[PDB]
């Protein structure tokens, strides 16, 4: 409770300047200390579900040897706006592992939908999240409909706390077997879409893996990350935003600033 109180007022001022709501949960995996701000409210996942999607693929690969190297062929009708990798392999197909890397590191929408199909759709990803003990996460729709970010709509949402707890289980805990855990971490470390979010708050000498989400409406965007500061245990954190009006713009700078405050509250000099 103490650390959450240290940064309560700065968080309130930051979201007031932003003009919306900011939700943050950050966990120091060494001491167990946490920082919360609106950490139990639901926020739209936007593309951030794609990280958990890749983890679910990795979990299935523990039971289905050769899943990762399976080729997937698809037609032009599988392409979705913002499919930067999968459009370049339309005429050849891609493997499940390549689709997973594209979904994580480029937020590729066609790749995400193809992998959702393999796992049984939104309910199948939700079922995987239930299997690791996450009772908050829900995915309901596909790309791009899941980005609607309608105020008060619980579809395609989770909470910053549940996102962080599930991220910890998959990247540092025992939810995945050791080889799959490191592959998930490696995919997150190679993300290309988050340079202006949590990574902007993290010194250059720290390792970081993250997954972004941007809904394109309602000031709604997010990022979650595992951060390895030098000389101490890793930090896991999630920063989610939303705003009341459809035309409100998200802010990457606000996400970076919220990450800075969370790390400061935890006592992580950065």
Ligand X SMILES: Cc1cc2oc(=O)cc(CP(=O)(O)O)c2cc1C
145 is catalytic: yes
Find the radius of gyration of the CA atoms of the chain: 18
Of the residues 31, 40, 131, 145, which is catalytic?
145
* 54 in contact with ligand X (CB under 6 A): no
Q: How far apart (Å, rounded) are the C-alpha atoms in residues 225 and 194?
A: 10
Q: Closer to ligand X by CB, 46 or 110: give it.
A: 46
Q: What is the DSSP letter of 195?
A: T
Q: Identify the burial level of 202 via C-beta atoms within 10 angstroms of its C-beta, where 0-12 means exposed, 13-18 middle and 19 or more buried.
A: buried
Q: Which residues contact 71 (CB under 8 A, 6 or more apart)?
A: 93, 94, 95
Asked if 119 touches ligand X (CB under 6 A), the answer is yes
Cβ-based nearer residue to ligand X, 11 or 218: 218
Contacting range for ligand X; rule: CB under 6 A; set: 70-78, 122-130, 165-173, 239-247: 122-130
Q: Of these, 34, 36, 100, 107, which contacts ligand X (CB under 6 A)? A: 107
Q: Does 111 contact ligand X by CB under 6 A? A: no
* Residue 82 interacting with ligand X (CB under 6 A): yes
47 is catalytic: yes
Identity of the residue, 60 or 155, whose beta carbon is nearer to ligand X in the bound complex: 60
**Residues forming a β-bridge with 209:** 226
- What SS3 state is found at 211? strand
Q: Read out DSSP for 114-183?
A: HHHHHTTHHHHHHHHHHHTT-SS-B----TTGGG---TT--TTEE-HHHHHHHHHHHHTSSSS-HHHHHH
Which C-beta is closer to ligand X: that of 3 or that of 18?
A: 18
Residues in 143-172 at the binding interface with ligand X, rule: CB under 6 A: 144, 147
Q: Is 243 in the site for ligand X (CB under 6 A)?
A: no
Q: Which residue of 4, 214, 241, 251 would you call a contact of ligand X, by CB under 6 A?
A: 214
CB within 8 A of 221, min separation 6: which ones?
46, 212, 213, 214, 215, 241, 250, 251, 252, 255
**Can residue 121 be called a binding residue for ligand X (CB under 6 A)?**
no
Q: Applying CB under 6 A, which residues contact ligand X?
A: 46-47, 56, 59-60, 82, 107, 109, 119, 124, 127-128, 131, 144, 147, 193, 212-216
Give catalytic residues, as residue numbers.
Answer: 47, 145
């Amino acid at each position: 409770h103490m650390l959450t109180n240290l940064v309560a007022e700065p968080f309130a001022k930051l979201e007031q300047d932003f003009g919306g709501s900011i939700g943050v949960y950050a966990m120091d995996t060494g001491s167990g200390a946490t920082v919360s701000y609106r950490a139990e409210e639901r926020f739209p996942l936007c593309s951030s579900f794609k990280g958990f999607l890749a983890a679910a693929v990795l979990a299935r690969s523990q039971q289905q040897a050769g899943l990762l190297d399976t080729p997937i062929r698809y037609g032009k009708n599988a392409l979705v706006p913002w499919s930067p990798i999968s459009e370049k392999y339309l005429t050849t197909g891609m493997t499940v592992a390549e689709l997973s890397a594209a979904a994580v590191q480029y937020s590729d929408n066609a790749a995400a939908n193809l992998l959702l199909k393999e796992l049984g759709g939104p309910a199948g990803l939700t079922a995987f999240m239930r299997s690791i003990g996450d009772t908050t996460f829900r995915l309901d729709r596909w790309e791009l409909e899941l980005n609607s970010a309608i105020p008060g709509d619980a579809r395609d949402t989770s909470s910053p706390r549940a996102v962080t707890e599930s991220l910890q289980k998959l990247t540092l805990g025992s939810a995945l077997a050791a080889p799959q855990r490191q592959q998930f971490v490696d995919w997150l470390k190679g993300n290309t879409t988050g340079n202006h979010r949590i990574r902007a708050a993290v010194p250059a000498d720290w390792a970081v893996g993250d997954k972004t989400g941007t809904c394109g409406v309602y000031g709604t965007a997010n990022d979650y990350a595992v951060v390895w500061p030098t000389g101490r245990a890793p930090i896991v954190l999630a920063v989610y935003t939303r705003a009341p009006n459809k035309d409100d713009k998200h802010s990457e700078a606000v996400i970076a600033a919220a990450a800075r405050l969370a790390l400061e509250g935890l006592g992580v000099n950065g």
